[PDB]
Amino acid sequence: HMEAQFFTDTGQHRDKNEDAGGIFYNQTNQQLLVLCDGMGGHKAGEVASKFVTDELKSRFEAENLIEQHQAENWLRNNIKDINFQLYHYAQENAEYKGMGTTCVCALVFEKSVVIANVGDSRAYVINSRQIEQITSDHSFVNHLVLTGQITPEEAFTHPQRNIITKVMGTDKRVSPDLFIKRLNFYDYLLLNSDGLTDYVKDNEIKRLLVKEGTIEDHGDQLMQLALDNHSKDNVTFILAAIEGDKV
Ligand SMILES: [Mg+2]
Ligand SMILES: [Mg+2]
Ligand SMILES: [Mg+2]
Ligand SMILES: [Mg+2]
Ligand SMILES: [Mg+2]
């Protein structure tokens, strides 16, 4: 496990906080990081994001030991099962029909992290010289950037900029992206909703983290930076400190 902290804010000009997440521990005190951005464009986004977060918590706390070689399968299978349960829960309740959420999550190991991603929430690793986005946004504008139809700058001024193309709960099937990242030579792991990075550039995040301070110092400053950039969305992130290999 890492020293890690969860941070969330409703943001300016949002009525409700539909982001969810947490830091959870299994029976041998291994660590799972979870972040979910419930869909504001559909009904009941807070129900969906907290549904997925609660299921991951419950499933992980029931486990004794998930070692690194089991982690990709565990995350893929549980994300698929939770998507199935959420989808049919939404179909069975007319006031929830159409609800959904992103999910990025990470199982932490001594020298690596295993990440699953559905949607446009993100995971990054950061050190003094670079910031690497591990995940790939399942967003319509990312589709437009990759197909060369718009520039990454034009993405921020697109009418359909908030649209996402892979979501938990909207279909009975889902295919999460799985990533394995070695933590050696990195200083921080960051999971975040788009309320942060829609408004704060990667280099701004890296510059903040290279400074002195605790995880809570950095987290509060990063939240203030998102708000100073007038984020119009819920802003949520988990910051986790990677312990350098001691001599
Ligand atoms: Mg949302
Ligand atoms: Mg709503
Ligand atoms: Mg977005
Ligand atoms: Mg270092
Ligand atoms: Mg959002």
Side-chain angles (χ1 to χ4, degrees), residues 1-12 14-110 112-153 155-181 183-200 202-231 233-245 247:
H1 74 131
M2 282 180 288
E3 182 65 38
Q5 188 167 342
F6 175 93
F7 305 82
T8 195
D9 196 271
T10 303
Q12 298 122 320
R14 273 293 262 115
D15 282 50
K16 183 186 306 176
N17 197 343
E18 296 178 357
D19 284 358
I23 298 160
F24 311 118
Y25 297 91
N26 70 6
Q27 295 173 23
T28 61
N29 288 293
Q30 305 182 278
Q31 190 181 54
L32 170 69
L33 314 178
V34 178
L35 190 147
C36 290
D37 182 345
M39 283 204 297
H42 291 88
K43 307 194 240 67
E46 73 283 3
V47 177
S49 61
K50 289 187 183 304
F51 183 109
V52 174
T53 300
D54 182 73
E55 281 295 318
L56 282 167
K57 178 182 201 293
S58 297
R59 292 155 183 259
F60 192 58
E61 294 181 349
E63 295 289 349
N64 179 246
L65 177 70
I66 304 170
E67 296 188 283
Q68 193 273 349
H69 69 283
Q70 303 167 268
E72 176 177 348
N73 182 75
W74 190 91
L75 287 165
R76 173 178 294 113
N77 285 4
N78 279 279
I79 288 291
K80 284 171 156 297
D81 190 49
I82 292 165
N83 175 78
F84 156 81
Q85 294 184 345
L86 177 60
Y87 171 80
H88 286 112
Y89 181 47
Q91 295 288 118
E92 292 159 7
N93 296 268
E95 75 278 22
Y96 298 155
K97 202 167 182 181
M99 71 173 166
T101 182
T102 74
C103 179
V104 62
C105 51
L107 285 170
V108 176
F109 297 96
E110 165 156 38
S112 64
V113 63
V114 179
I115 296 166
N117 184 59
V118 177
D120 72 343
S121 306
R122 293 183 177 173
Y124 290 83
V125 282
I126 306 118
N127 64 27
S128 54
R129 280 174 162 154
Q130 62 168 298
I131 172 161
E132 172 182 356
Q133 184 181 322
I134 299 171
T135 54
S136 186
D137 284 13
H138 305 134
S139 67
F140 188 64
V141 286
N142 201 23
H143 169 89
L144 296 178
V145 169
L146 297 164
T147 56
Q149 306 185 60
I150 70 177
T151 75
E153 288 80 9
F156 300 98
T157 180
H158 205 274
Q160 302 156 316
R161 92 214 133 230
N162 291 326
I163 299 193
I164 53 183
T165 58
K166 200 187 305 287
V167 194
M168 304 282 285
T170 58
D171 192 85
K172 67 185 172 292
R173 289 179 272 194
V174 71
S175 187
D177 283 348
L178 269 292
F179 305 90
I180 301 179
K181 187 67 186 176
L183 299 180
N184 308 62
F185 298 95
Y186 293 107
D187 299 323
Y188 296 92
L189 173 69
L190 171 72
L191 276 56
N192 66 276
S193 70
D194 65 353
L196 171 67
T197 40
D198 283 357
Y199 297 92
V200 182
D202 284 6
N203 190 65
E204 290 178 289
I205 297 171
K206 185 197 70 170
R207 263 194 150 274
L208 186 151
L209 296 177
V210 79
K211 299 163 65 154
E212 184 262 326
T214 63
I215 286 293
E216 193 160 319
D217 288 338
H218 287 147
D220 293 345
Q221 295 157 13
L222 186 56
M223 183 66 74
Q224 292 303 123
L225 182 52
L227 298 178
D228 201 47
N229 275 107
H230 297 99
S231 176
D233 193 9
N234 311 142
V235 183
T236 301
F237 52 88
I238 296 169
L239 187 59
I242 303 167
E243 184 179 7
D245 310 41
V247 61

mmCIF file of all heavy atoms in Angstrom, residues 104-129, unseen atoms left out:
data_model
loop_
_atom_site.group_PDB
_atom_site.id
_atom_site.type_symbol
_atom_site.label_atom_id
_atom_site.label_comp_id
_atom_site.label_asym_id
_atom_site.label_seq_id
_atom_site.Cartn_x
_atom_site.Cartn_y
_atom_site.Cartn_z
ATOM 1 N N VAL A 104 -12.227 4.523 -13.025
ATOM 2 C CA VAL A 104 -10.810 4.184 -13.085
ATOM 3 C C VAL A 104 -10.432 3.641 -11.716
ATOM 4 O O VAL A 104 -10.825 4.193 -10.677
ATOM 5 C CB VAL A 104 -9.935 5.390 -13.505
ATOM 6 C CG1 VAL A 104 -10.024 6.532 -12.506
ATOM 7 C CG2 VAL A 104 -8.480 4.959 -13.751
ATOM 8 N N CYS A 105 -9.703 2.536 -11.707
ATOM 9 C CA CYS A 105 -9.314 1.948 -10.437
ATOM 10 C C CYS A 105 -7.944 1.307 -10.570
ATOM 11 O O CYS A 105 -7.480 1.001 -11.669
ATOM 12 C CB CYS A 105 -10.371 0.953 -9.932
ATOM 13 S SG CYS A 105 -10.895 -0.317 -11.109
ATOM 14 N N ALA A 106 -7.316 1.080 -9.425
ATOM 15 C CA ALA A 106 -5.920 0.674 -9.407
ATOM 16 C C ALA A 106 -5.674 -0.239 -8.221
ATOM 17 O O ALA A 106 -5.988 0.127 -7.087
ATOM 18 C CB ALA A 106 -5.015 1.898 -9.320
ATOM 19 N N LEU A 107 -5.134 -1.420 -8.493
ATOM 20 C CA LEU A 107 -4.610 -2.290 -7.450
ATOM 21 C C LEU A 107 -3.119 -2.015 -7.300
ATOM 22 O O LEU A 107 -2.374 -2.031 -8.289
ATOM 23 C CB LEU A 107 -4.863 -3.765 -7.783
ATOM 24 C CG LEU A 107 -6.308 -4.237 -7.605
ATOM 25 C CD1 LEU A 107 -6.485 -5.637 -8.189
ATOM 26 C CD2 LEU A 107 -6.670 -4.239 -6.126
ATOM 27 N N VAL A 108 -2.694 -1.754 -6.064
ATOM 28 C CA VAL A 108 -1.332 -1.311 -5.759
ATOM 29 C C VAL A 108 -0.486 -2.505 -5.339
ATOM 30 O O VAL A 108 -0.903 -3.301 -4.489
ATOM 31 C CB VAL A 108 -1.343 -0.251 -4.645
ATOM 32 C CG1 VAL A 108 0.100 0.133 -4.250
ATOM 33 C CG2 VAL A 108 -2.155 0.962 -5.064
ATOM 34 N N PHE A 109 0.726 -2.597 -5.888
ATOM 35 C CA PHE A 109 1.690 -3.630 -5.529
ATOM 36 C C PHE A 109 3.008 -2.959 -5.194
ATOM 37 O O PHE A 109 3.138 -1.736 -5.296
ATOM 38 C CB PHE A 109 1.802 -4.659 -6.658
ATOM 39 C CG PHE A 109 0.511 -5.367 -6.889
ATOM 40 C CD1 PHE A 109 -0.367 -4.936 -7.873
ATOM 41 C CD2 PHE A 109 0.123 -6.395 -6.047
ATOM 42 C CE1 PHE A 109 -1.606 -5.566 -8.044
ATOM 43 C CE2 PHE A 109 -1.090 -7.020 -6.209
ATOM 44 C CZ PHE A 109 -1.959 -6.608 -7.214
ATOM 45 N N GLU A 110 3.980 -3.767 -4.766
ATOM 46 C CA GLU A 110 5.237 -3.206 -4.276
ATOM 47 C C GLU A 110 5.901 -2.331 -5.330
ATOM 48 O O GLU A 110 6.316 -1.202 -5.043
ATOM 49 C CB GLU A 110 6.177 -4.326 -3.839
ATOM 50 C CG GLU A 110 7.613 -3.857 -3.671
ATOM 51 C CD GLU A 110 8.412 -4.728 -2.727
ATOM 52 O OE1 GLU A 110 8.226 -5.963 -2.755
ATOM 53 O OE2 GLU A 110 9.223 -4.175 -1.953
ATOM 54 N N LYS A 111 5.997 -2.826 -6.563
ATOM 55 C CA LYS A 111 6.742 -2.115 -7.590
ATOM 56 C C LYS A 111 5.917 -1.844 -8.838
ATOM 57 O O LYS A 111 6.487 -1.474 -9.869
ATOM 58 C CB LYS A 111 8.011 -2.891 -7.968
ATOM 59 N N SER A 112 4.596 -2.015 -8.780
ATOM 60 C CA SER A 112 3.774 -1.823 -9.967
ATOM 61 C C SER A 112 2.347 -1.517 -9.539
ATOM 62 O O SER A 112 1.972 -1.671 -8.374
ATOM 63 C CB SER A 112 3.809 -3.051 -10.880
ATOM 64 O OG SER A 112 3.239 -4.173 -10.230
ATOM 65 N N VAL A 113 1.558 -1.056 -10.505
ATOM 66 C CA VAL A 113 0.137 -0.823 -10.315
ATOM 67 C C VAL A 113 -0.585 -1.453 -11.495
ATOM 68 O O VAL A 113 -0.069 -1.464 -12.617
ATOM 69 C CB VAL A 113 -0.169 0.690 -10.194
ATOM 70 C CG1 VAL A 113 0.188 1.444 -11.489
ATOM 71 C CG2 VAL A 113 -1.590 0.936 -9.790
ATOM 72 N N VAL A 114 -1.765 -2.009 -11.235
ATOM 73 C CA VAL A 114 -2.617 -2.563 -12.280
ATOM 74 C C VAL A 114 -3.877 -1.718 -12.295
ATOM 75 O O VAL A 114 -4.522 -1.558 -11.256
ATOM 76 C CB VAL A 114 -2.921 -4.050 -12.040
ATOM 77 C CG1 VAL A 114 -3.835 -4.605 -13.135
ATOM 78 C CG2 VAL A 114 -1.606 -4.853 -11.949
ATOM 79 N N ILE A 115 -4.188 -1.139 -13.452
ATOM 80 C CA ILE A 115 -5.254 -0.152 -13.603
ATOM 81 C C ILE A 115 -6.289 -0.662 -14.598
ATOM 82 O O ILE A 115 -5.939 -1.161 -15.675
ATOM 83 C CB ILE A 115 -4.666 1.194 -14.072
ATOM 84 C CG1 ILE A 115 -3.722 1.752 -13.001
ATOM 85 C CG2 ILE A 115 -5.774 2.202 -14.441
ATOM 86 C CD1 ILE A 115 -2.868 2.874 -13.505
ATOM 87 N N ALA A 116 -7.566 -0.519 -14.247
ATOM 88 C CA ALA A 116 -8.659 -0.696 -15.198
ATOM 89 C C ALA A 116 -9.369 0.629 -15.429
ATOM 90 O O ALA A 116 -9.515 1.436 -14.504
ATOM 91 C CB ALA A 116 -9.670 -1.727 -14.706
ATOM 92 N N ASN A 117 -9.817 0.859 -16.662
ATOM 93 C CA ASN A 117 -10.431 2.145 -16.978
ATOM 94 C C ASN A 117 -11.619 1.975 -17.910
ATOM 95 O O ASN A 117 -11.533 1.269 -18.917
ATOM 96 C CB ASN A 117 -9.423 3.114 -17.612
ATOM 97 C CG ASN A 117 -10.037 4.474 -17.840
ATOM 98 O OD1 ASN A 117 -10.479 5.110 -16.896
ATOM 99 N ND2 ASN A 117 -10.094 4.915 -19.091
ATOM 100 N N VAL A 118 -12.722 2.633 -17.561
ATOM 101 C CA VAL A 118 -13.905 2.744 -18.408
ATOM 102 C C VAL A 118 -14.312 4.207 -18.354
ATOM 103 O O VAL A 118 -14.763 4.683 -17.309
ATOM 104 C CB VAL A 118 -15.070 1.860 -17.934
ATOM 105 C CG1 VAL A 118 -16.271 2.097 -18.824
ATOM 106 C CG2 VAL A 118 -14.699 0.373 -17.935
ATOM 107 N N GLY A 119 -14.143 4.925 -19.461
ATOM 108 C CA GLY A 119 -14.595 6.306 -19.509
ATOM 109 C C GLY A 119 -13.463 7.301 -19.670
ATOM 110 O O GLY A 119 -12.396 6.945 -20.186
ATOM 111 N N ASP A 120 -13.682 8.552 -19.245
ATOM 112 C CA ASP A 120 -12.687 9.610 -19.407
ATOM 113 C C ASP A 120 -12.153 10.120 -18.074
ATOM 114 O O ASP A 120 -11.547 11.197 -18.031
ATOM 115 C CB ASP A 120 -13.267 10.765 -20.231
ATOM 116 C CG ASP A 120 -14.306 11.572 -19.470
ATOM 117 O OD1 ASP A 120 -14.837 11.091 -18.449
ATOM 118 O OD2 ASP A 120 -14.608 12.695 -19.910
ATOM 119 N N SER A 121 -12.326 9.363 -16.989
ATOM 120 C CA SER A 121 -11.462 9.602 -15.843
ATOM 121 C C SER A 121 -10.071 9.054 -16.166
ATOM 122 O O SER A 121 -9.887 8.304 -17.132
ATOM 123 C CB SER A 121 -12.054 8.974 -14.577
ATOM 124 O OG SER A 121 -13.400 9.445 -14.394
ATOM 125 N N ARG A 122 -9.075 9.464 -15.382
ATOM 126 C CA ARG A 122 -7.689 9.232 -15.773
ATOM 127 C C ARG A 122 -6.834 8.686 -14.640
ATOM 128 O O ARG A 122 -7.119 8.879 -13.456
ATOM 129 C CB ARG A 122 -7.058 10.533 -16.275
ATOM 130 C CG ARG A 122 -7.668 11.037 -17.573
ATOM 131 C CD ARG A 122 -6.947 12.284 -18.070
ATOM 132 N NE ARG A 122 -7.507 12.696 -19.353
ATOM 133 C CZ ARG A 122 -7.186 13.817 -19.986
ATOM 134 N NH1 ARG A 122 -6.281 14.636 -19.465
ATOM 135 N NH2 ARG A 122 -7.756 14.111 -21.151
ATOM 136 N N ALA A 123 -5.729 8.044 -15.035
ATOM 137 C CA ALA A 123 -4.647 7.705 -14.129
ATOM 138 C C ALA A 123 -3.350 8.199 -14.741
ATOM 139 O O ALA A 123 -3.140 8.065 -15.951
ATOM 140 C CB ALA A 123 -4.548 6.198 -13.864
ATOM 141 N N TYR A 124 -2.503 8.772 -13.894
ATOM 142 C CA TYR A 124 -1.191 9.301 -14.266
ATOM 143 C C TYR A 124 -0.115 8.779 -13.333
ATOM 144 O O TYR A 124 -0.381 8.522 -12.157
ATOM 145 C CB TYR A 124 -1.149 10.802 -14.129
ATOM 146 C CG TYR A 124 -1.945 11.636 -15.098
ATOM 147 C CD1 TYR A 124 -3.307 11.888 -14.901
ATOM 148 C CD2 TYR A 124 -1.315 12.229 -16.180
ATOM 149 C CE1 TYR A 124 -4.011 12.715 -15.772
ATOM 150 C CE2 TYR A 124 -1.996 13.049 -17.047
ATOM 151 C CZ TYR A 124 -3.357 13.277 -16.850
ATOM 152 O OH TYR A 124 -4.018 14.104 -17.711
ATOM 153 N N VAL A 125 1.132 8.703 -13.838
ATOM 154 C CA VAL A 125 2.313 8.653 -12.980
ATOM 155 C C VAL A 125 3.136 9.907 -13.255
ATOM 156 O O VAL A 125 3.146 10.428 -14.378
ATOM 157 C CB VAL A 125 3.163 7.374 -13.161
ATOM 158 C CG1 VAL A 125 2.513 6.193 -12.431
ATOM 159 C CG2 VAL A 125 3.396 7.045 -14.636
ATOM 160 N N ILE A 126 3.771 10.425 -12.208
ATOM 161 C CA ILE A 126 4.448 11.720 -12.258
ATOM 162 C C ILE A 126 5.782 11.612 -11.540
ATOM 163 O O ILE A 126 5.869 11.027 -10.456
ATOM 164 C CB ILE A 126 3.577 12.821 -11.611
ATOM 165 C CG1 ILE A 126 2.183 12.854 -12.243
ATOM 166 C CG2 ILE A 126 4.226 14.186 -11.728
ATOM 167 C CD1 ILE A 126 1.082 12.552 -11.274
ATOM 168 N N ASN A 127 6.835 12.166 -12.148
ATOM 169 C CA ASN A 127 8.063 12.413 -11.395
ATOM 170 C C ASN A 127 8.571 13.823 -11.673
ATOM 171 O O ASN A 127 7.840 14.650 -12.222
ATOM 172 C CB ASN A 127 9.136 11.347 -11.679
ATOM 173 C CG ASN A 127 9.624 11.338 -13.122
ATOM 174 O OD1 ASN A 127 9.592 12.345 -13.821
ATOM 175 N ND2 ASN A 127 10.104 10.184 -13.558
ATOM 176 N N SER A 128 9.816 14.119 -11.279
ATOM 177 C CA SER A 128 10.300 15.490 -11.388
ATOM 178 C C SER A 128 10.415 15.961 -12.831
ATOM 179 O O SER A 128 10.340 17.168 -13.084
ATOM 180 C CB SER A 128 11.653 15.616 -10.688
ATOM 181 O OG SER A 128 12.568 14.659 -11.195
ATOM 182 N N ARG A 129 10.567 15.047 -13.789
ATOM 183 C CA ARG A 129 10.775 15.440 -15.173
ATOM 184 C C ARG A 129 9.608 15.151 -16.104
ATOM 185 O O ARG A 129 9.542 15.755 -17.180
ATOM 186 C CB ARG A 129 12.027 14.755 -15.736
ATOM 187 C CG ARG A 129 13.308 15.458 -15.324
ATOM 188 C CD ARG A 129 14.542 14.704 -15.756
ATOM 189 N NE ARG A 129 15.715 15.572 -15.736
ATOM 190 C CZ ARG A 129 16.962 15.147 -15.579
ATOM 191 N NH1 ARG A 129 17.210 13.855 -15.410
ATOM 192 N NH2 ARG A 129 17.959 16.018 -15.583
#
